[PDB]
Design a protein around this ligand. Structure first.
Ligand SMILES: CCn1cnc2c1c(=O)[nH]c(=O)n2Cc1ccc(Cl)cc1
Length: 127
């Protein structure tokens, strides 16, 4: 089953801002998760063809991945840190919806999420 167009990483008519919190989300939260040993399946949109997951986009109607989030952060797509945090939460939730508890990909998601919650705990107050 085939791949949809990926989520946008630009949108000229969407409002956006730069904040120290969004910068922390790029410099710290994304960079740290990206370098983890379990990050690779989350670094790009799910390719349902290559991975032989033909049901994926029958079940996941709001897909999200850290490649997308990385480009959104780099391109100043967001209005505030909350919009970005939702994207990470969408990514994790999709994983938990599509797969079974304790599947390898779910353990990977859980490790990344643990780390995510740790880094978000030190999100600086908006300056
Ligand atoms: C997080 C999106 N994603 C990327 N690859 C995935 C998935 C997924 O949700 N379920 C999957 O089954 N696979 C394939 C897969 C399965 C196990 C491992 Cl260790 C890696 C990828």
């Amino acid at each position: 089953s085939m791949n949809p167009p990926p989520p946008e990483t630009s949108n000229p008519n969407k409002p956006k801002r730069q904040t120290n919190q969004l910068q922390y989300l790029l410099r710290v939260v994304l960079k740290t998760l990206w370098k983890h040993q379990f990050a690779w399946p989350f670094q790009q949109p799910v390719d349902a063809v290559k991975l032989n997951l033909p049901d994926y986009y029958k079940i996941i109607k709001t897909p999200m991945d850290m490649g997308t989030i990385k480009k959104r952060l780099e391109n100043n797509y967001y209005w505030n840190a909350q919009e970005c945090i939702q994207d990470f939460n969408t990514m994790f939730t999709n994983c938990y919806i599509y797969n079974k508890p304790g599947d390898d990909i779910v353990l990977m998601a859980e490790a990344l999420e643990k780390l995510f919650l740790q880094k978000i705990n030190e999100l600086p107050t908006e300056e």
